[PDB]
Amino acid sequence: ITGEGQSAGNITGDDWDRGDKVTGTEGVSARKRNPSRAGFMGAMPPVDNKRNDETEKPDFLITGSSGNTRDGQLVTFSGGARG
Amino acid sequence: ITGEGQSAGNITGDDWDRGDKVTGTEGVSARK
Amino acid sequence: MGIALGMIETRGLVPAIEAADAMTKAAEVRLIGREFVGGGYVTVLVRGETGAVNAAVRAGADACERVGDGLVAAHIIARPHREVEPALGN
Amino acid sequence: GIALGMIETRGLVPAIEAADAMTKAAEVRLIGREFVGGGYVTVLVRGETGAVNAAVRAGADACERVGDGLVAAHIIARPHREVEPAL
Amino acid sequence: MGIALGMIETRGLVPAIEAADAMTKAAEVRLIGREFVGGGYVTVLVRGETGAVNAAVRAGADACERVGDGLVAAHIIARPHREVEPALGN
Amino acid sequence: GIALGMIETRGLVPAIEAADAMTKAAEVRLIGREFVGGGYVTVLVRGETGAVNAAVRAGADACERVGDGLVAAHIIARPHREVEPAL
Amino acid sequence: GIALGMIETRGLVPAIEAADAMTKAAEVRLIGREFVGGGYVTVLVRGETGAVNAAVRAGADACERVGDGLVAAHIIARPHREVEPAL
Amino acid sequence: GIALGMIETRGLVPAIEAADAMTKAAEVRLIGREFVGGGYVTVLVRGETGAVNAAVRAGADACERVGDGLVAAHIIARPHREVEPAL
Amino acid sequence: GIALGMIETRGLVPAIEAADAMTKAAEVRLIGREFVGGGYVTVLVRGETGAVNAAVRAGADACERVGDGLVAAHIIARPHREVEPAL
Amino acid sequence: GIALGMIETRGLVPAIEAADAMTKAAEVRLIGREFVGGGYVTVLVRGETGAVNAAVRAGADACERVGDGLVAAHIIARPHREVEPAL
Amino acid sequence: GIALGMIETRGLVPAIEAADAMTKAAEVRLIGREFVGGGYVTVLVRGETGAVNAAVRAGADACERVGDGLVAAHIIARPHREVEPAL
Amino acid sequence: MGIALGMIETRGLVPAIEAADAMTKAAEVRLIGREFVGGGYVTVLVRGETGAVNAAVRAGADACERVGDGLVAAHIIARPHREVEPALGN
Amino acid sequence: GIALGMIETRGLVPAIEAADAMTKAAEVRLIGREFVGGGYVTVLVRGETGAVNAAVRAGADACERVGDGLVAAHIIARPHREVEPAL
Amino acid sequence: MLICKVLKPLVSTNRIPGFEHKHLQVVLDGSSNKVAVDAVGCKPGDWVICVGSSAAREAAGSKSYPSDLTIVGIIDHWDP
Amino acid sequence: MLICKVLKPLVSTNRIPGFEHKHLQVVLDGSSNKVAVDAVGCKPGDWVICVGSSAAREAAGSKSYPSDLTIVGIIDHWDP
Amino acid sequence: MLICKVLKPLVSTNRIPGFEHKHLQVVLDGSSNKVAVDAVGCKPGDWVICVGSSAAREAAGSKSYPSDLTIVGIIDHWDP
């Protein structure tokens, strides 16, 4: 149904691929084929975003962290405590 | 208690230094 | 030859031949069978390319149901098996 | 292959880009590049049934977002023997 | 030799090969690849003509959604170019 | 035999439990122990239709509660030869 | 210069303005001006991808504010072999 | 014995501390560590069935909080010889 | 020349759709396809800067819808020679 | 010294910086730098009991603030004689 | 260049962008690209402290806004003798 | 020779040497320095192995808080580097 | 070279912690330790500008918590030669 | 303002604000090369006049516009 | 704009706003040396184009940005 | 940016905004003399880098700051 825009081109005039109706072998009562099983009960695994913690403030730049501003470890009072 | 992060590393899993309990000579009734 | 199979079954052959006309008017499909099931059921087999057969069956299911008693049973077969060919006139 | 694929639109960027998708998606021979007048421009390509099918899929899906948009997307698996004398 | 490349990926090999069997049964096409993308993404790669590829992928989508965690992507390519061919294992 | 039975599960422990139930539930040879990635593990057994059917049902309904749980349980009976690359 | 661009608008005040910008921007060749009919005018340009891109963007933004302005404008990087029939 | 005990964890440090509990609780020798993928880690210990059961009990009771925690830890006292290729 | 176009996506259906856009919209060489893991599928092409730009825009607006669609996409014009041995 | 120190984390900056603290704090030999998959990376160092103790102190206290953070910090004073064959 | 930096992210659009900036910024040597698994990609760089600092900051802030961006980035000024095992 | 440097500073020499005696009694370690920082800051510097240093500093913290104005800083170093060694009076 | 890193703190426990960071994180020479009086303890090191920057950042984020922590911290890149005899 | 003989056109590249840069043209002021945005006409170039500084910004169309020199006019009778 | 052949890279130093300075690169305009922020590509450098003035500020990313010259583009066909 | 070898220091005079001018230093760009505010280090001077234009203002500390050129960094490996 996703492919490359199968149903996107639905303005197409007269003759078309797909299955408007009475088109047995397109998975309707057909795809069931080999009996699969559901089980699971919980779907997708609970993947956690490794990025977390945060809490405190990153250690005074110069070791990691993007964006931001402050100073190139200038002699300014900031220097170490640049924050 | 301050040192260099003695209790900061408290996620440390199984075996550890320190004094969870019944550890007489760590100053409890000892340091006096 | 395109192995894609279209087949349409109707009560009476007037809708069957309407379906066959939709077949031979829509796409590159050749009717490979016109058979009388028994007791009035008439059905038609055409063969051709997958998209061609799909469009033809679409046209038949658009122009067949309201003709007399009308369409009773249609479908498409995409990639028919080799062993089915004996049942298809061999 | 005698299948005909057709697109109408308002302008030439839609027409030319739709034709580029037409020919890139699958093997189809462009036969007609006709300026109707009044802003209508049409492209007609020739190819087999599945090729024209997928190619006009791609052509519409590339052309939809140009100008006022594609006006008509339409194909025939095989036109009659008597249509092409007035192609 | 049907150059049209149909292919679909899903969660685990149960839905993947069920879709593969659906494609090779409903349509007479040749699958060329089974790939492990990683993290559950497993992909089946089949070659055939445009109509046969269309029928095969429709069947795979029909028979793959109701098994496992289901299908994810179900789009095809009608006329793959030569340069993609090395990416298919040349 | 030509019948293929095959299952995923999240976690290798339920996978080997299911394959263990495969290999004692019915006369069957197992051919595949595949690590899908991200935790999906797939077991591939080969045998005749009745044996694979019974074995898969037994392993699935015994492995439902084992560990994290199963994924899918439907089985094909007469696989096409074209699944040879799955070997 | 296989890379192809084209500027289409309503009336050719913006069309000739955009074509002037086209030729003004790079070593591009104007291969054809076409009267669509109904007021649309199209101007074709050929060259390499970067030069064509610069020209088309310059002309489009220059002509969007003159008179009634552009209608649409995009670029074809790898035009098909049917370009010769298209011109 | 011939029993094979299994442990599964979210990550390998809990898995192998559980394996330490395995080999340090009872007379059981671990035959393998396997990274399933996506973080799932299993350890496979081999030994006497009672020893295996006691060891698994100890490890599971030890490793609930270690790392992110356990996933699966069940045992078969008689895994098939057919499981040996998977071992 | 050395212009580096590249696409990341989730599931390789959009990856190869973008590759098709690469090879059909522009004339560039496809230098790599990499399975990062975790679902990331990456395509790597080299060619002319403007041609690569046309290729990447086509790949984006083609494969951004299919399945999970593209995840990240940007162009590299003149990559450092030191980077090349790593690719 | 047969004491093992272990850290799991999400990424390599946490892993490499934690290992640098590992080795800077005291004399410990890094033995394992293992990529679990799914984002999990682990470091295993070898040293005596007090050295591993203080070293893993420093490693956690240097690594806590990188990425999503350290996942598991764990050490053993002496693993069993039977663990290292699967180190 | 004993001084070591490394850029780690999710997917390698930002990874190769950051590595391009790395090599782009100074006379630094890219010693290794590693696929973590689960989508994380790491790029190592060696050089002196100032050059490595400039490169890492440039690449990090450049890649924070591309695609899904960086995850973390810091520098090692005096890497331990275990760097050779680490690579 | 336990290279691990434990050391703690406090308000005046009463708590300082009480902590020193606690370290040298609860643990068998060798203190190497008594320093007057200035303004009441007086520091004791002891060498030992990591476990012995840990026990000594725990004892010093336990026995030093309840005397004088009390302890202030109670952190240690496990593996001091060679370059710090001259700062210890070489 | 002459790059002057230096730290002030209250109580010398953080002073020597920062000195440990100096000597372990970077390769610089420790030129002085001064007892100002009033609790101020100062460490003075010389080395390479980038190396000194890494050293001072490590010293700051290491000793800022211990006891009273650091009080003032800044870097000097190229101190005047006249200053040197006073130190 | 800078007297300036148009020399040649340019080519696009990997900058974003080119939406307003509008086909930069290499020009010459009699000493060396230069490039300025073509506002009205460049041709091969006989003699045109070029404006820079901050005026260039509002000379090109926007206060925030990124330029240092814009051509502003054409001298019909030119100058030797 | 200033035609400019990239020459070499730079090294960091003790300034604070380097968070946005983004790896300055020494370039040459044919007469002497210069340095400008690399926005898109420097390489050894065949021929790129450099923008300064106040435009440089918004050419580099910010109105308050401290620059006098930023490279803005690459000329594919370059110039002798 | 302007490559610049520090030459000598300056002396105060009868201007009011010197509160922020912060010890101007005569530098040389290889051709003639110049003077720029020392932000971080001048020494006798091996090779440092100097930034001017309006960036200089925010390079020196204030939008309203009166400067045309500020030294911004030091090149450790310098250049012949």
Short mmCIF file of N, CA, C and O in Angstrom, two decimals, chain A residues 49-51 61-68 71-72 82, chain K residues 8 10 40 53 57 60-61 64 70-75:
data_model
loop_
_atom_site.label_atom_id
_atom_site.label_comp_id
_atom_site.label_asym_id
_atom_site.label_seq_id
_atom_site.Cartn_x
_atom_site.Cartn_y
_atom_site.Cartn_z
N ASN A 49 15.56 5.44 25.01
CA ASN A 49 16.51 6.40 24.42
C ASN A 49 17.74 6.48 25.33
O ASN A 49 17.61 7.04 26.44
N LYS A 50 18.87 5.94 24.89
CA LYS A 50 20.11 5.93 25.72
C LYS A 50 20.36 7.35 26.26
O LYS A 50 20.88 7.47 27.38
N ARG A 51 20.00 8.37 25.48
CA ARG A 51 20.17 9.78 25.93
C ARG A 51 19.19 10.03 27.08
O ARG A 51 17.97 9.94 26.86
N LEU A 61 31.65 23.19 29.38
CA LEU A 61 32.07 23.09 27.99
C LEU A 61 33.39 22.34 27.85
O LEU A 61 33.65 21.40 28.60
N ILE A 62 34.19 22.73 26.86
CA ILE A 62 35.55 22.25 26.56
C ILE A 62 35.65 20.73 26.52
O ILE A 62 36.63 20.17 26.02
N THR A 63 34.63 20.03 27.03
CA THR A 63 34.56 18.58 26.92
C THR A 63 33.12 18.25 26.55
O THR A 63 32.29 18.01 27.43
N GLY A 64 32.83 18.24 25.25
CA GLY A 64 31.50 17.92 24.77
C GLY A 64 30.55 19.10 24.71
O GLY A 64 30.94 20.24 24.94
N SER A 65 29.29 18.80 24.34
CA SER A 65 28.16 19.72 24.33
C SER A 65 28.24 20.69 23.15
O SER A 65 29.25 21.38 22.96
N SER A 66 27.16 20.76 22.37
CA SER A 66 27.09 21.60 21.19
C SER A 66 26.27 22.86 21.44
O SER A 66 25.85 23.11 22.58
N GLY A 67 26.02 23.64 20.39
CA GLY A 67 25.25 24.86 20.51
C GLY A 67 25.96 25.90 21.35
O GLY A 67 27.06 26.33 21.01
N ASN A 68 25.30 26.34 22.43
CA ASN A 68 25.91 27.14 23.49
C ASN A 68 26.60 28.41 23.01
O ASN A 68 26.46 28.81 21.85
N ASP A 71 32.70 31.30 26.20
CA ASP A 71 34.03 31.79 25.87
C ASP A 71 34.98 30.64 25.54
O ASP A 71 34.81 29.52 26.03
N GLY A 72 35.96 30.92 24.68
CA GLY A 72 36.97 29.89 24.36
C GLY A 72 37.93 29.72 25.52
O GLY A 72 39.13 29.97 25.33
N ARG A 82 33.27 29.05 33.34
CA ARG A 82 32.60 29.67 32.17
C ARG A 82 31.10 29.41 32.24
O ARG A 82 30.32 30.32 31.90
N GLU K 8 30.38 11.19 18.06
CA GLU K 8 29.43 10.10 18.01
C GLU K 8 28.01 10.63 17.88
O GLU K 8 27.62 11.61 18.52
N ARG K 10 23.79 9.52 16.01
CA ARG K 10 22.84 8.51 15.56
C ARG K 10 22.71 8.67 14.05
O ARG K 10 22.28 9.72 13.56
N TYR K 40 24.07 4.16 16.30
CA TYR K 40 25.15 5.05 16.68
C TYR K 40 26.37 4.81 15.79
O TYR K 40 26.71 3.67 15.48
N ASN K 53 40.75 20.47 19.34
CA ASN K 53 39.68 21.25 19.95
C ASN K 53 38.92 22.04 18.90
O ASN K 53 37.68 22.02 18.87
N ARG K 57 34.96 21.19 17.99
CA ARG K 57 33.91 22.18 18.23
C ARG K 57 33.23 22.57 16.92
O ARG K 57 31.99 22.63 16.86
N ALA K 60 31.05 19.58 15.80
CA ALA K 60 29.92 19.34 16.68
C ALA K 60 28.82 20.37 16.44
O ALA K 60 27.65 20.01 16.28
N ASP K 61 29.18 21.65 16.40
CA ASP K 61 28.14 22.66 16.21
C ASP K 61 27.61 22.64 14.78
O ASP K 61 26.46 23.04 14.54
N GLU K 64 25.15 19.44 14.87
CA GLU K 64 24.01 19.45 15.78
C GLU K 64 22.69 19.74 15.07
O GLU K 64 21.63 19.38 15.61
N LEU K 70 24.26 15.32 16.53
CA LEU K 70 25.22 14.73 17.45
C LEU K 70 24.51 14.06 18.62
O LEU K 70 23.31 14.24 18.84
N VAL K 71 25.27 13.27 19.39
CA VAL K 71 24.82 12.80 20.69
C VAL K 71 25.71 13.31 21.81
O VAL K 71 25.21 13.85 22.81
N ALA K 72 27.03 13.18 21.67
CA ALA K 72 27.98 13.75 22.61
C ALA K 72 29.34 13.84 21.94
O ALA K 72 29.62 13.15 20.96
N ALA K 73 30.20 14.71 22.49
CA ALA K 73 31.53 14.91 21.92
C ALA K 73 32.42 15.57 22.97
O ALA K 73 32.11 16.67 23.43
N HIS K 74 33.51 14.90 23.34
CA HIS K 74 34.51 15.48 24.22
C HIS K 74 35.88 15.02 23.76
O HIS K 74 36.02 14.24 22.82
N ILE K 75 36.91 15.52 24.44
CA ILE K 75 38.29 15.38 23.99
C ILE K 75 39.12 14.74 25.09
O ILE K 75 38.86 14.92 26.28
#
